Amino acid sequence: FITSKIWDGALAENNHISSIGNIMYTNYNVWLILASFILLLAMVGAIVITIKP
Amino acid sequence: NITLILFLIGILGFVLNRKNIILMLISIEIMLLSITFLILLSSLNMDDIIGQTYAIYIIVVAGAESAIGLGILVAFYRLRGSIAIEY
Amino acid sequence: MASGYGLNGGPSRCFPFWQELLACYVTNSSEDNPDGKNKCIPVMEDYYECLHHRKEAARVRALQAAYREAEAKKLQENPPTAGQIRNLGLLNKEEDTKKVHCA
Amino acid sequence: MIMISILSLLLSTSVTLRRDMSILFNRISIIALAYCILHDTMSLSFISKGIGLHGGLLHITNLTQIFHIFIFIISILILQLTSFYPRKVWIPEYSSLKDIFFNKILYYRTKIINKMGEHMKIIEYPLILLFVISGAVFLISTNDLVSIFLSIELQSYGLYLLSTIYRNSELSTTGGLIYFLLGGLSSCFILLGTSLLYVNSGTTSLDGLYILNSISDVNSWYKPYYLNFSLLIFSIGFLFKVSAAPFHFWSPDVYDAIPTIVTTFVAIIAKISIFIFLLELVYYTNSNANSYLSEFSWTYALLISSLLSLIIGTVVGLTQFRIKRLLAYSTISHVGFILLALSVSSIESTQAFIFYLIQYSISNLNAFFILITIGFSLYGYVTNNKEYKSLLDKNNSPIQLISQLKGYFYINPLLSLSLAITIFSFVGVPPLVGFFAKQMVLSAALDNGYIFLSLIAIITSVIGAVYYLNVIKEIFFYSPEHEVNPVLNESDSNFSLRILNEKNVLIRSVLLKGRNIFISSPFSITISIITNVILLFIFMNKEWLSMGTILVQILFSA
Amino acid sequence: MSAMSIYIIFVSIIAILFLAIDLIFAPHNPYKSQSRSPFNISFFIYGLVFLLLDLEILLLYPFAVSEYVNSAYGLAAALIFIGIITIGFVYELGHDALKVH
Amino acid sequence: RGLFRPRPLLAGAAVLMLYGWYKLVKGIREQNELAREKMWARIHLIPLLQAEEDRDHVRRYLADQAREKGLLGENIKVYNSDRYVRPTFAVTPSKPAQE
Amino acid sequence: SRHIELKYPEVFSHGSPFNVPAGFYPNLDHVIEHYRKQHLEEEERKAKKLAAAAAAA
Amino acid sequence: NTPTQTYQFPSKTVKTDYPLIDNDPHFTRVIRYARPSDYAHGLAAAAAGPAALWLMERISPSQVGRGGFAKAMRLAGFIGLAGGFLYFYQRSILRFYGMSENAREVEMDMREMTDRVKAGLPLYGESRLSPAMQGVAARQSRYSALFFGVMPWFNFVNHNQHGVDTAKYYQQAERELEAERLAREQA
Amino acid sequence: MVNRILFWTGFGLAVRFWQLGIEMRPFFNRKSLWAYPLFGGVGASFGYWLQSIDEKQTKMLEERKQAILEKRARRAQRQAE
Amino acid sequence: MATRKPAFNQHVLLDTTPLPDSIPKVKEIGASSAPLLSASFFIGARCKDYNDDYMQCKNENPGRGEFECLKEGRRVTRCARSVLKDINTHCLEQFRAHWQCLDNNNQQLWQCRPAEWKLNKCVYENLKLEKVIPDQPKNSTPVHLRQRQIFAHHAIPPWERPFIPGQ
């Protein structure tokens, strides 16, 4: 494998966590909403089946 | 290719297991990690942050599913006292 | 991949191929003429080549075999050393630059 | 709307620990779903094969919106079981519209109506049900591989939680454990299939996968074996969740172990969402030109599962004696018909598929409602049967044996007739809605050359009819083993009822007996409407069949 | 050979030496059923709520290193996500699953 | 003792918080202004750096095409497009330099 | 139908706006013109329907 | 000043009965173009929720303890208010989509948007968001009111991607910018 | 004879009858008689609404038939070359 | 050679083959990172048009910008080369002071304002080039013309003054 540099592409590089953050809340935020509902359901579900009311 | 071998290991967990249902949960976690490992390496080869984002949601969902399954197992153990199948 | 968002915050390296594949399909395929999507076949191959590099790998190893075959036939009386190589194009090392370039 | 109801219900539920609020929370979930129907009804004034939404992660079609509404309506009907007490006190002197709206009746209701029953004291039950509904609607509307996975986990995880929400039952906790364990395996196959799609195509978009497939269907360096092979692994995980053979073994245990009211929702809601989602995926991957791709088409897994579900579903049902295990095997047989219609992808088969799924869901709904209502009708009956005395979780599943229905036609004939009509519809006897459903699937299969599968379908139907006839034989051909409770009507055991006006002033008093306790109206009316829809379909079929005709014409619109 | 790589080696070597001294010089002589009790559900609940809450924080860390680009639009969806997960925390508090009293 | 009455402590806390936020507004705004200068400084350099890299890629693409036609007799076509794709693989000599 | 109509034609506007190399994005003017025509045709079809079949009543 | 590019983004074309005004109208346009019957329908829809719960209580009493019914009515009122408002929003926005009879609205948008052209205003306003973020906002909320039974969403962003060729507005503005000039000349 | 309004008025009457039969409650006591005009009235409403669905469905199917023929025609004229 | 960030590289591959004679030859820039950072705004002053033209040429030729824009590529090199000769003729001392300060200060411009103000005055009164930063907030002083730098490790001498051109 061979690699070289670019300059226009490297003007302000993001770390991977910043590249994810760029799109995670705006372009693909439906996934984030869906995941929150799964986390919500997991929280309420695991509590309801294990503890005395 | 490592991800393939890991998926086999998780698959073989069910094949080699008649009585240990705790190993059943672990095999599901190995398979999920194997599939996530494969997505992550492919998205590095294809220069795609969406693949990394997909991995993050699988981790979240796998974590949430482990929470539910451990909860269901606890509701089962409370009435039974064993996690062992009499086979 | 096809998303348009690469690892460094820029666009993904295969996105232009994906955009052109979608462009070819939208403007050549239709309900009146379904066979226009056959024009997309070479663009789809280019997108698959950008993702996975099979054809490029097949060419480079075919060529490298020939390159290493011919390189063995020739006789290197005085190949450049790594030290001379590391002085290529440097401010006060004109002798090493000429030796490396065989000029 | 469904997301607002869940969050608002959760917040009200969060700050309450009062178990008498369960019946009220269930009734609000009904109101919330009625608004969801209203909003989706307004969203049906366009014609499109599909509009992508929210950055292309979701989509809407006319078919998507119709089955959103259908899921809401089935969920409102199931929600009645937890919104009304099973039995009521009715007398002919509190029957006028002025009495119902301005007067009130006072009597000791707690024992009669089963006020503190288990299905009336689980606060979060309507809320978990809404989470499953959200999983199902989102999966119908999913345009994207990541959206598919998130939606299917959301619906699946709620179903596991529903199967275990009766935490004090050993049977329920066991069934929840089984569902989660084998459902976790099936989810891995779905994630594996979605992952192999992504690593090969470089896209998460379903649109993009269909485009690649469309170009690859021409008549060498990157021949696209992955698409069929990925969807094959993908489909197997979905075959587990609809309990198609040979991935069926879990459902007869789980459906029998969990309480019957839970089974009603668990056994019905998931098939609707997965089958509808599979429909679009089947249409857009269908290789029109006979190429090498069609040789390895993933949809043969659907056709093999259809064959195996026809045989297993009918043969294994022959020696079932537990009524809920018989319904599980009856569903697997009916899934074989649904899978045949989906596998043959034609305008006729898609029409047959759409009509079959909706009629099957209302029919399996009628069977569960009748089974629950019969169980709640034995309140004023006693039996000395030794077999019935050794049943487990009798409160959760009052009817567990087919033998418990012996002579039930002598206990309540019209409710027994409703059961018999529903079962004869499962067989496919004309002119019930079930016959017309089977007739449409057979037509399309024969018109597309699926003769061998057409013949196996008719032969399996005769075998399936045997255990259906056996339930009916039990109800009609024998005397019952249940007798009315002597003390419930002993000529000296009267409970008091006060009738009062709007000013809480006593108008009259009346003495009452066990003979004045009836099935609550919500269950009798629901059974009655559905029974008459099954029976009188031949006079009502135009608009219902035309809806599927228009939907398919849009999906196939060249 | 990088500083981080050398660092892990040296830290592990420290642990080996300490083990080595006590396993070589300290005197050694080998001096050398049970009952089952129920366990407290509180310990599963602590781990449960920790795990789900720890997952929610991880999903917010990309936002903290992407705020300039996200601007108003990202903040809205980040706030929606926060609002949804604090409702589940309100459920955890209100139902006293931490055994408040 | 006044050192432990909540009211002067609360007032003291609020002033420190109010001062710290006022300074944070001045800091992040000037820091955002420094980032504007740094990018525009890089922007002015990008064409002269990119043109130098563009020439280097042109040189080596041609040298690879000359190698292939000399070695293999003709040029194998990897892409059907005419576009320049930066190579993923490169022919390498069998050994590195000696020193 | 064999031809696939995009549910989400706006996917043509996807792509990161940061660190864009010069000449990276392919030209999409024929594509936008394709969807301009699709929109203008549909509006005309509605225009020539509720203005031509409405003059009868 | 026609921008010479009045259709800048590939939009989804949808078969409907009535002319498309705006596939992603701003929240305040949807409120302003609402008909008085939309308020009537939305309020009656909102009241239906707590009224249905009250009717169930009077005909099939819940046997709840002392304060339970007030708590359920508070939640039912909020559910009805949410559902009533979403239904109200849908009724108005369906005319912007062209999915419902919209003649009063087609006139009003033509009136309003021609006026901004003659004032030199941007047709849809000025955004604090980056152009790319406007694109993301436009692609999230376009036709999103058709999903209101599942997920709500509203456009609070001033973007320029509304799915409609805007040459018609510039044609109308210069047509009457010339008429207003000729009257000034005839004076 | 399939008149929608009369049929669904009858359907509502049959629902009340079957419901009373399922409940093992008398079919006709005087103070309950308002229910039959009610169930039948709700049935009549369902069938006026089904009437208007049928009108829309017929128009949609008629447009579809023309489009298929129009599609068939142009393809036939295309093959004339 | 791809733009992927390497992680396991252990070797470098060099090609000695020159450009073909069909391509006109340009001499490359011989300035390292610190000097051309301190000359960047002066390059941006004289060479804006050619810089923009070269990037517009490449955008006009997607997928082919390398090969189809070599001549405009050569013009950018010659214009930036002209600024670096010009500064090395008229402002060499102040040039060296600034980039040697930058090269000791993590190449951060706010750590070298006194040297930058010295050079900006010298460049302005010899080559008539002005440092310009687009879209700076109008209510505030431009950051590069502020007496005090909040993020500078060394506080700035009160006597050293920002160079406002034309004052």
TrEMBL record, chain C:
Disulfide bonds join C14-C50, C24-C40. It is found in: Mitochondrion inner membrane; Mitochondrion intermembrane space. Coiled coil: none annotated. Signal peptide: none annotated. It comes from the Eukaryota. Mammalian complex I is composed of 45 different subunits. This is a component of the iron-sulfur (IP) fragment of the enzyme. Belongs to the complex I NDUFS5 subunit family. Accessory subunit of the mitochondrial membrane respiratory chain NADH dehydrogenase (Complex I), that is believed not to be involved in catalysis. Complex I functions in the transfer of electrons from NADH to the respiratory chain. The immediate electron acceptor for the enzyme is believed to be ubiquinone. This is NADH dehydrogenase [ubiquinone] iron-sulfur protein 5.
From TrEMBL, chain D:
Keywords: Membrane, Mitochondrion, Transmembrane, Transmembrane helix. InterPro entries: NADH-Q_OxRdtase_suN/2, ND/Mrp_TM. It catalyses: a ubiquinone + NADH + 5 H(+)(in) = a ubiquinol + NAD(+) + 4 H(+)(out). This is NADH-ubiquinone oxidoreductase chain 2. GO terms for molecular function: NADH dehydrogenase (ubiquinone) activity. It is a multi-pass membrane protein. Belongs to the complex I subunit 2 family. PANTHER family: NADH DEHYDROGENASE (PTHR22773). GO terms for cellular component: membrane. It is found in: Membrane. It comes from the Eukaryota. HAMAP family: NDH1_NuoN_1. The chain crosses the membrane at residues 28-47, 67-85, 122-140, 178-199, 225-242, 254-278, 298-319, 326-347, 353-382, 414-437, 449-469, 517-539.
TrEMBL record, chain E:
It catalyses: a ubiquinone + NADH + 5 H(+)(in) = a ubiquinol + NAD(+) + 4 H(+)(out). The chain crosses the membrane at residues 6-26, 43-65, 71-93. It is found in: Membrane; Mitochondrion membrane. It is a multi-pass membrane protein. The keyword Membrane applies. Its EC number is 7.1.1.2. Keywords: Electron transport, Membrane, Mitochondrion, NAD, Respiratory chain, Translocase, Transmembrane, Transmembrane helix, Transport, Ubiquinone. GO terms for cellular component: mitochondrial membrane; NADH dehydrogenase complex. GO terms for molecular function: NADH dehydrogenase (ubiquinone) activity. Belongs to the complex I subunit 3 family. Core subunit of the mitochondrial membrane respiratory chain NADH dehydrogenase (Complex I) which catalyzes electron transfer from NADH through the respiratory chain, using ubiquinone as an electron acceptor. Essential for the catalytic activity of complex I. This is NADH-ubiquinone oxidoreductase chain 3. It comes from Chaetomium thermophilum (strain DSM 1495 / CBS 144.50 / IMI 039719). The chain holds residues 1 to 114 of 146 of the full protein.
From TrEMBL, chain F:
One of its GO terms (cellular component) is mitochondrial inner membrane. Its main location: mitochondrion. It is found in: Mitochondrion inner membrane. Transmembrane segments: none annotated. It is a single-pass membrane protein. Keywords: Electron transport, Membrane, Mitochondrion, Mitochondrion inner membrane, Respiratory chain, Transmembrane, Transmembrane helix, Transport. Complex I functions in the transfer of electrons from NADH to the respiratory chain. Accessory subunit of the mitochondrial membrane respiratory chain NADH dehydrogenase (Complex I), that is believed not to be involved in catalysis. Belongs to the complex I NDUFA13 subunit family. This is NADH dehydrogenase [ubiquinone] 1 alpha subcomplex subunit 13. The chain holds residues 23 to 121 of 121 of the full protein.
